[PDB]
Amino acid sequence: QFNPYGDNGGTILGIAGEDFAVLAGDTRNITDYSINSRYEPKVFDCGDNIVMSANGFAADGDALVKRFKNSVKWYHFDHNDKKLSINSAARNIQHLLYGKRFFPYYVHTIIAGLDEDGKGAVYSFDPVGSYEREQCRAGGAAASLIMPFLDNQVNFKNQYEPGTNGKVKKPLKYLSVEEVIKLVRDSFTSATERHIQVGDGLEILIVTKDGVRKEFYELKRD
């Protein structure tokens, strides 16, 4: 019997800063125990200061991103070159996903950018279109390895102030872009050690008011 779905592995991570946002993902593409590519870009600049990644089944992921990029193009044509806000992009993606409710895009989608007040924004989607704004979100193979770490080191969960013994929480102080990238790199370095599908390379897309910048880092190739 024909199986229309597959699993191309991969892991992605979106973090929203105070006045910035990052969307990272490894560059390894796989089937079963084979490596298809050591460098296959997974996070894309979609225009209007929005970055996107649809992790899971890569054919559905490529199709969705391609359709969203097309939606941005037609939004400009139909609405006098108006900038597509991150919240409007999110709602539009819900409709793209729910349009295939009974034959889903087998992907976990994440987008990042800035909201209309200039603050950092990340949105997270399930395969059929349910979505939410989030501060911190990992997706894909090693998401279970990364998120507990982020709960602890970004949101300071289970961390209290010394001397008070549980009475006073560690205060939630804002993180810089340099501090976030350190956590992203350490997240993927740790995931690489313990998950077979994670490795080869790490590509990060950073979004600010100035635009979209890229950073690349090598990962272990075993």
């Binding site: 229309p4 191309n8 089937t31 084979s34 298809n36 590519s37 890569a58 054919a59 199709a63």
Partner: protein, 233 residues
């Protein structure tokens, strides 16, 4: 939904400094029966592209006809059909990848794994893969089926990353491809000795080699092997 009947095995390929190489054997299997011994699975499109196909042969022959019709259609009302508005590898691939994903989305796939090898207008090497699921990816080396498991490891020792491509000559690349084809003949039960090889170079163009054979094989050591453990004679 169907099952593949008459099938073709591995297609292997890699990039080198000035272009790309692609190869595939000339067999059409019918399960374990090695039925058809003269099947060409590399199909050139113009003088800048070669499409290598594995999997179902009936679906390959259909794709072969789509590409032939693509060339005809591109020439219509096109004075620059043999120049600036000729078909590029990137155009040919994107078309096939669209068709493959559309066909899987109607639950009626073309039961193939395809590699499109070629050189672009600006001299850039093109090498990308697509299969029955519409899954696509690119890499300095690409291979289908058994080739993925056995050829890629050997070809990756020559070109391990992007920076190794300018350091790799056409002689070294062809040597590596030919060796990989021998290894596949040793170890793939649905392979043949006879194969075709195509080189697409930005300077010397498209060289298409037919009727190549696996040679320099090691079998002599077999005479010393006796029994399965304790047999001395």
């Amino acid at each position: 939904t169907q099952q593949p009947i008459v099938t073709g095995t591995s297609v292997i390929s890699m990039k080198y400094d000035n272009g790309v190489i692609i190869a595939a054997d000339n067999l059409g299997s019918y399960g374990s029966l090695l039925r058809f011994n003269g099947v060409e699975r590399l199909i050139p499109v113009g003088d800048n592209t070669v499409v290598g196909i594995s999997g179902d042969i009936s679906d390959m022959q259909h794709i072969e006809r789509l590409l032939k019709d693509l060339v005809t259609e591109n020439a219509y009302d096109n004075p620059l059909a043999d120049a600036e508005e000729a078909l590029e590898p990137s155009y040919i691939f994107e078309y096939l990848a669209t068709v493959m994903y559309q066909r899987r989305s109607k639950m009626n796939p073309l039961w193939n794994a395809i590699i499109v090898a070629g050189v672009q207008s600006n001299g850039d090497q093109f090498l990308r893969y697509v299969n029955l699921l519409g899954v696509t990816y690119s890499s300095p080396t690409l291979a289908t089926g058994f080739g993925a498991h056995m050829a890629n490891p050997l070809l990756r020792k020559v070109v391990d990353r992007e920076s190794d491509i300018p350091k790799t000559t056409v002689q070294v690349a062809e040597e590596a491809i030919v060796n990989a084809m021998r290894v596949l003949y040793y170890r793939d039960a649905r392979s043949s000795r006879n194969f075709s090889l195509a080189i697409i170079d930005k300077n010397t163009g498209l060289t298409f080699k037919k009727n190549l054979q696996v040679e320099n094989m090691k079998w002599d050591f077999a005479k010393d092997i006796k029994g399965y453990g304790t047999q001395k004679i």
